[PDB]
Amino acid sequence: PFRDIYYRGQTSLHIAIERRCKHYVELLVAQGADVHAQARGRFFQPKDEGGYFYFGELPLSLAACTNQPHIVNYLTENPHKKADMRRQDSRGNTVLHALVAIADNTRENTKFVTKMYDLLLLKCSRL
Amino acid sequence: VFNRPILFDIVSRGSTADLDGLLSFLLTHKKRLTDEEFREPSTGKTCLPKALLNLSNGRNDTIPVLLDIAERTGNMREFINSPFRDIYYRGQTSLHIAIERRCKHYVELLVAQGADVHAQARGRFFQPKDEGGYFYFGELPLSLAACTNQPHIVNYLTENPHKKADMRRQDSRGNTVLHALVAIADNTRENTKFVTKMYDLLLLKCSRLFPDSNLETVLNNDGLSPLMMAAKTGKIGVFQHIIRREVTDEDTRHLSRKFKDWAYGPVYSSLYDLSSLDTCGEEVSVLEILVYNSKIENRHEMLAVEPINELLRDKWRKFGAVSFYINVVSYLCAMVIFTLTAYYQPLEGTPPYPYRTTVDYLRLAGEVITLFTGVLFFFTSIKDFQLLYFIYSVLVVVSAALYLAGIEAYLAVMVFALVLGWMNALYFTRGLKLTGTYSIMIQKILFKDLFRFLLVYLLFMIGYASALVTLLNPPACRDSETFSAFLLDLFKLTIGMGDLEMLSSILLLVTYIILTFVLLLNMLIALMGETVGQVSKESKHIWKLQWATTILDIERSFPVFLRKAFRSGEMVTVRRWCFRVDEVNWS
Amino acid sequence: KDLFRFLLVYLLFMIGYASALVTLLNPPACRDSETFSAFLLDLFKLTIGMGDLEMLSSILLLVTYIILTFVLLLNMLIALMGETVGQVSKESKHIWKLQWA
Ligand SMILES: CC(C)C[C@H](NC(=O)c1cc2ccccc2s1)C(=O)N1CCN(C(=O)[C@H](CO)NS(=O)(=O)c2ccc(Cl)cc2Cl)CC1
């Protein structure tokens, strides 16, 4: 975990997913990584509160907001430790509320948000 | 041969057959190919441009015969670089003609044989369209090959193994290819497409040859450089690209302006360089040129460029907004002091210095403060919209001057300064709450209404008075004695509040006064019609441009070199005072 | 909007015009004997509302200055007229929907 205020708890899993490279993310997760990492940092708060990017403060939500369908599939279907979609955050958003925190009126942004948002509910309901 | 026209006709038609054997009499008469017989009296046009002027699908095969003939004549140097002597043309060597015909085939042959590449078409025709010339291209073959969208020739003309022209070579106005390449730039999409394309081509080429300095460093006689010249001439197309100039090649990456600092998933933070947009007053800056210049044509959209709109807003947040509110409140209190000071100004007549009371001292302070701000304004007006401001400074100075002498009946200027002071106050109040549309409406109606009306106003005075004297030798207006002023006031109330006695208190006078009524009414309606259509809802842009004026107006006020500076940047490999901008994209 | 744009000009001219007035008089037309400016205030209240202002004809700067308040007052009303017409927006057909709900 980082110790800054401009960053915090940004475990290696956060970096690996954000680079949009599942190749090392799965390797990192398989070896055993804290999937319930909490990027409780100033940079990670909404644009209104001084942070540039809010994504739910969870790798699962980070993999969700950033439009990473394959990693969210694996990160919840991986045989090793996995994150429950219900896992809340500082504001209790969970992936669904956070996935709406990055939603935008732009056509393309709403396209994957609504797409993946449906993906999560179907996944969560079955489990 | 026997006469010049036949030689010109023969070469123009491209017939080398009859051209053969002419060398016989050239040697026999020892006449040089550049002699007066081969040159026009006025233009001095030589066979070369004449032959090149009639380029027949790139098949003008008469040129090498002349080149071979020139070699035989023993005078080949002057033959190639043949300068015209007109005013409508000048120095238009054969190289200029060859390139302009968009035929590199003969240009390379001409250059290879040796031509004055640094030719200077210093002619009337070649000046900008504003100065009587139809085409300006930098006044150099390299710039001529650049402006005319000739990529292959500019590549060769600078990469040719023989003599080549350095891109830094200046001209009469010191433009060089880059400034000239911006002199032909146009807002049209296609024109900006090759200009920006080839403009980048030149910088990359110049940088590799001369890594010490980028080509934009060289300044024209006016002292602008491309970006400023594009800024001063309102070339949005080129300009909006120059600021966003990013070069991938590492050796030539340094000459970029839109870096890429970092990205956190879908948020990007491009680190724009603005080494020219803000010089802290050390040197002229694009931002100052872009707002404090009236000749600009595209100001509203030019400000919209990324590190310009954000840059102004950044100044607003820190040291642009607080100093604005310190200005409104401090200035408003100054006038209120002037208002109260004037109101309670010492009564009882003859107030040289009647201050012998506690409240009198407070009034004395009010007069002193207004006197101080009156002269303080004077220094900041001479140091440099300041018109009303300048009039305030002298008038308040005039007031205290007469007062200090204890001379009565000269509070007139002091009060008239006050009304101007509050008229001056229109400036600051404009910059907040999207105000100032009042100010724009005032000036547009100011000049118009007065002389449309006063024309009609006095038009009817004499017109109607002269008809009036028919009934009377000057009663209703002036009993006994000949005046027309009382008639003037009569009309002043006829429309303002009516109640005109007229001579009922003969019919033509009744009919004529009807015209002034209907004429006056519709003019007011037309004035009403003019104003409504003139509002334009501010176009949402006048405030933006006018607002930016306030921020920069404040910045030049206090010493910028102090800790009022935009963000700094790294030292080397990317010591440039860069500025940060952050944009989020989900693509 | 209207109130403090006008009342600013309204009191702006009271003192501005009264101070120019005392040049002719130590305080007649507005207040014979004794120094008040309120009667001047009402004088302007009628100058535009219904006219009929006596002024001191009942020196020229006072005539010129009272011309400014007139032209300044008139165009401000025109600008106020200009502001209102552009502000109507025909309700945009949406304010009623939201307000009705
Ligand atoms: C922080 C200040 C040192 C910056 C500087 N000074 C002032 O503003 C003032 C000086 C004083 C002195 C006595 C009473 C009142 C004031 S207000 C400054 O800001 N500038 C310098 C040149 N300028 C001026 O000299 C006038 C400033 O009054 N220009 S103005 O038309 O009257 C004006 C006034 C307020 C605002 Cl919102 C904008 C403007 Cl266009 C303009 C810009």
GROMACS .gro file of N, CA and C and ligand atoms in nm, chain B residues 292 316 319-335 369 372-374 376-381 383-386 388-389 392-393 421 424-431 546 549-559, ligand 1:
model
  216
  419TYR      N    1  -0.570   4.211  -2.700
  419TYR     CA    2  -0.545   4.355  -2.707
  419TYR      C    3  -0.517   4.400  -2.849
  443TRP      N    4  -0.799   3.343  -1.328
  443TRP     CA    5  -0.920   3.386  -1.258
  443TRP      C    6  -0.925   3.328  -1.117
  446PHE      N    7  -0.553   3.518  -0.799
  446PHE     CA    8  -0.494   3.648  -0.827
  446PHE      C    9  -0.562   3.719  -0.943
  447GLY      N   10  -0.671   3.665  -0.996
  447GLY     CA   11  -0.748   3.732  -1.099
  447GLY      C   12  -0.888   3.766  -1.052
  448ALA      N   13  -0.942   3.684  -0.963
  448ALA     CA   14  -1.074   3.706  -0.905
  448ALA      C   15  -1.070   3.791  -0.779
  449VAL      N   16  -0.978   3.762  -0.687
  449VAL     CA   17  -0.969   3.841  -0.564
  449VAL      C   18  -0.931   3.985  -0.597
  450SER      N   19  -0.832   4.003  -0.685
  450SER     CA   20  -0.793   4.139  -0.723
  450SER      C   21  -0.903   4.209  -0.800
  451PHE      N   22  -0.995   4.133  -0.859
  451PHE     CA   23  -1.112   4.194  -0.923
  451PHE      C   24  -1.210   4.245  -0.818
  452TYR      N   25  -1.237   4.164  -0.716
  452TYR     CA   26  -1.330   4.205  -0.611
  452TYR      C   27  -1.269   4.312  -0.522
  453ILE      N   28  -1.138   4.308  -0.500
  453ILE     CA   29  -1.072   4.418  -0.430
  453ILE      C   30  -1.086   4.547  -0.510
  454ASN      N   31  -1.099   4.535  -0.642
  454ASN     CA   32  -1.106   4.654  -0.727
  454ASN      C   33  -1.246   4.714  -0.725
  455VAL      N   34  -1.349   4.631  -0.743
  455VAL     CA   35  -1.486   4.681  -0.740
  455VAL      C   36  -1.515   4.748  -0.606
  456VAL      N   37  -1.485   4.680  -0.496
  456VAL     CA   38  -1.521   4.733  -0.364
  456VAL      C   39  -1.439   4.857  -0.332
  457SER      N   40  -1.307   4.849  -0.353
  457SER     CA   41  -1.221   4.963  -0.322
  457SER      C   42  -1.257   5.083  -0.409
  458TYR      N   43  -1.280   5.061  -0.538
  458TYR     CA   44  -1.316   5.172  -0.626
  458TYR      C   45  -1.454   5.226  -0.593
  459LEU      N   46  -1.551   5.137  -0.572
  459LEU     CA   47  -1.686   5.182  -0.540
  459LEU      C   48  -1.686   5.269  -0.414
  460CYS      N   49  -1.609   5.228  -0.313
  460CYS     CA   50  -1.599   5.310  -0.192
  460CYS      C   51  -1.533   5.444  -0.222
  461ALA      N   52  -1.441   5.447  -0.318
  461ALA     CA   53  -1.378   5.574  -0.355
  461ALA      C   54  -1.481   5.672  -0.410
  462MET      N   55  -1.568   5.626  -0.499
  462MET     CA   56  -1.671   5.715  -0.552
  462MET      C   57  -1.770   5.756  -0.443
  496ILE      N   58  -0.861   6.189  -0.006
  496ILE     CA   59  -0.861   6.057  -0.068
  496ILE      C   60  -0.900   6.068  -0.215
  499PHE      N   61  -0.616   6.212  -0.398
  499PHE     CA   62  -0.508   6.115  -0.417
  499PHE      C   63  -0.541   6.017  -0.528
  500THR      N   64  -0.660   5.957  -0.523
  500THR     CA   65  -0.699   5.862  -0.627
  500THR      C   66  -0.714   5.933  -0.761
  501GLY      N   67  -0.738   6.064  -0.759
  501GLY     CA   68  -0.745   6.139  -0.883
  501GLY      C   69  -0.611   6.147  -0.955
  503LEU      N   70  -0.336   5.946  -0.862
  503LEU     CA   71  -0.292   5.808  -0.880
  503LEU      C   72  -0.344   5.752  -1.011
  504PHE      N   73  -0.470   5.782  -1.044
  504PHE     CA   74  -0.524   5.743  -1.174
  504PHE      C   75  -0.445   5.805  -1.287
  505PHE      N   76  -0.395   5.927  -1.267
  505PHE     CA   77  -0.322   5.996  -1.373
  505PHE      C   78  -0.197   5.919  -1.413
  506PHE      N   79  -0.122   5.869  -1.316
  506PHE     CA   80   0.002   5.798  -1.347
  506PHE      C   81  -0.026   5.670  -1.426
  507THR      N   82  -0.126   5.592  -1.385
  507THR     CA   83  -0.158   5.468  -1.454
  507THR      C   84  -0.222   5.492  -1.590
  508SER      N   85  -0.271   5.613  -1.617
  508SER     CA   86  -0.325   5.644  -1.749
  508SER      C   87  -0.215   5.685  -1.845
  510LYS      N   88   0.099   5.605  -1.800
  510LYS     CA   89   0.192   5.493  -1.809
  510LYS      C   90   0.165   5.409  -1.934
  511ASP      N   91   0.038   5.382  -1.963
  511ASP     CA   92   0.002   5.305  -2.081
  511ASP      C   93   0.029   5.385  -2.208
  512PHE      N   94  -1.032   5.260  -2.379
  512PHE     CA   95  -1.114   5.248  -2.259
  512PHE      C   96  -1.064   5.342  -2.150
  513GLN      N   97  -0.935   5.377  -2.158
  513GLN     CA   98  -0.878   5.472  -2.063
  513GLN      C   99  -0.921   5.615  -2.089
  515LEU      N  100  -1.230   5.779  -2.088
  515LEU     CA  101  -1.308   5.826  -1.974
  515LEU      C  102  -1.223   5.828  -1.848
  516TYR      N  103  -1.136   5.728  -1.832
  516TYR     CA  104  -1.046   5.724  -1.718
  516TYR      C  105  -0.951   5.843  -1.718
  519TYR      N  106  -1.129   6.162  -1.617
  519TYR     CA  107  -1.147   6.167  -1.473
  519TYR      C  108  -1.024   6.223  -1.404
  520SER      N  109  -0.906   6.170  -1.439
  520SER     CA  110  -0.785   6.205  -1.365
  520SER      C  111  -0.756   6.355  -1.375
  548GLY      N  112  -1.704   5.965  -1.305
  548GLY     CA  113  -1.653   5.861  -1.218
  548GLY      C  114  -1.745   5.741  -1.213
  551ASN      N  115  -1.734   5.593  -1.549
  551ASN     CA  116  -1.615   5.507  -1.545
  551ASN      C  117  -1.645   5.377  -1.473
  552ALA      N  118  -1.733   5.382  -1.372
  552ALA     CA  119  -1.759   5.263  -1.291
  552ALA      C  120  -1.826   5.153  -1.373
  553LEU      N  121  -1.877   5.186  -1.491
  553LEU     CA  122  -1.942   5.086  -1.575
  553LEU      C  123  -1.847   4.971  -1.609
  554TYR      N  124  -1.716   4.998  -1.608
  554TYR     CA  125  -1.619   4.898  -1.652
  554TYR      C  126  -1.620   4.776  -1.561
  555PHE      N  127  -1.589   4.794  -1.433
  555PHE     CA  128  -1.576   4.678  -1.345
  555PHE      C  129  -1.708   4.603  -1.329
  556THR      N  130  -1.820   4.675  -1.316
  556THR     CA  131  -1.948   4.608  -1.297
  556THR      C  132  -1.982   4.522  -1.418
  557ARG      N  133  -1.928   4.557  -1.535
  557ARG     CA  134  -1.953   4.479  -1.656
  557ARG      C  135  -1.901   4.336  -1.645
  558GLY      N  136  -1.787   4.315  -1.579
  558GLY     CA  137  -1.721   4.185  -1.584
  558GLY      C  138  -1.788   4.076  -1.502
  673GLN      N  139  -1.448   3.998  -2.361
  673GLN     CA  140  -1.440   4.112  -2.270
  673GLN      C  141  -1.395   4.067  -2.131
  676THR      N  142  -1.035   4.031  -2.112
  676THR     CA  143  -0.968   4.160  -2.104
  676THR      C  144  -0.941   4.200  -1.960
  677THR      N  145  -1.037   4.173  -1.871
  677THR     CA  146  -1.020   4.211  -1.731
  677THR      C  147  -0.903   4.136  -1.668
  678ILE      N  148  -0.898   4.004  -1.687
  678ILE     CA  149  -0.793   3.923  -1.625
  678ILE      C  150  -0.656   3.974  -1.667
  679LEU      N  151  -0.636   3.992  -1.798
  679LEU     CA  152  -0.508   4.042  -1.846
  679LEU      C  153  -0.486   4.187  -1.806
  680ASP      N  154  -0.593   4.266  -1.798
  680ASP     CA  155  -0.579   4.404  -1.754
  680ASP      C  156  -0.523   4.409  -1.612
  681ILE      N  157  -0.571   4.322  -1.524
  681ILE     CA  158  -0.520   4.316  -1.387
  681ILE      C  159  -0.375   4.268  -1.387
  682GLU      N  160  -0.345   4.165  -1.466
  682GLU     CA  161  -0.213   4.103  -1.460
  682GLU      C  162  -0.103   4.203  -1.493
  683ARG      N  163  -0.121   4.281  -1.599
  683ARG     CA  164  -0.024   4.384  -1.632
  683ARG      C  165  -0.019   4.494  -1.526
  684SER      N  166  -0.121   4.504  -1.441
  684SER     CA  167  -0.126   4.608  -1.339
  684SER      C  168  -0.012   4.595  -1.240
  685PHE      N  169  -0.010   4.486  -1.164
  685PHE     CA  170   0.091   4.462  -1.063
  685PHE      C  171   0.208   4.385  -1.122
  686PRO      N  172   0.323   4.383  -1.053
  686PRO     CA  173   0.441   4.317  -1.111
  686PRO      C  174   0.423   4.166  -1.122
  816LIG     C1  175  -0.437   4.528  -0.736
  816LIG     C2  176  -0.425   4.664  -0.804
  816LIG     C3  177  -0.293   4.729  -0.764
  816LIG     C4  178  -0.428   4.642  -0.956
  816LIG     C5  179  -0.451   4.771  -1.037
  816LIG     N1  180  -0.512   4.875  -0.955
  816LIG     C6  181  -0.655   4.903  -0.952
  816LIG     O1  182  -0.731   4.842  -1.018
  816LIG     C7  183  -0.709   5.015  -0.863
  816LIG     C8  184  -0.631   5.123  -0.818
  816LIG     C9  185  -0.710   5.217  -0.740
  816LIG    C10  186  -0.667   5.328  -0.667
  816LIG    C11  187  -0.761   5.405  -0.599
  816LIG    C12  188  -0.895   5.373  -0.603
  816LIG    C13  189  -0.940   5.264  -0.674
  816LIG    C14  190  -0.849   5.187  -0.742
  816LIG     S1  191  -0.882   5.043  -0.840
  816LIG    C15  192  -0.536   4.735  -1.159
  816LIG     O2  193  -0.625   4.658  -1.146
  816LIG     N2  194  -0.513   4.791  -1.292
  816LIG    C16  195  -0.408   4.888  -1.321
  816LIG    C17  196  -0.457   4.978  -1.433
  816LIG     N3  197  -0.600   4.990  -1.414
  816LIG    C18  198  -0.654   5.112  -1.358
  816LIG     O3  199  -0.580   5.201  -1.332
  816LIG    C19  200  -0.803   5.132  -1.330
  816LIG    C20  201  -0.841   5.055  -1.204
  816LIG     O4  202  -0.945   5.122  -1.139
  816LIG     N4  203  -0.885   5.094  -1.445
  816LIG     S2  204  -1.055   5.092  -1.431
  816LIG     O5  205  -1.120   5.113  -1.561
  816LIG     O6  206  -1.104   5.208  -1.355
  816LIG    C21  207  -1.105   4.936  -1.355
  816LIG    C22  208  -1.146   4.933  -1.221
  816LIG    C23  209  -1.184   4.813  -1.162
  816LIG    C24  210  -1.180   4.698  -1.237
  816LIG    CL1  211  -1.229   4.545  -1.161
  816LIG    C25  212  -1.140   4.698  -1.368
  816LIG    C26  213  -1.102   4.817  -1.428
  816LIG    CL2  214  -1.050   4.818  -1.599
  816LIG    C27  215  -0.679   4.873  -1.448
  816LIG    C28  216  -0.601   4.751  -1.401
   0.00000   0.00000   0.00000
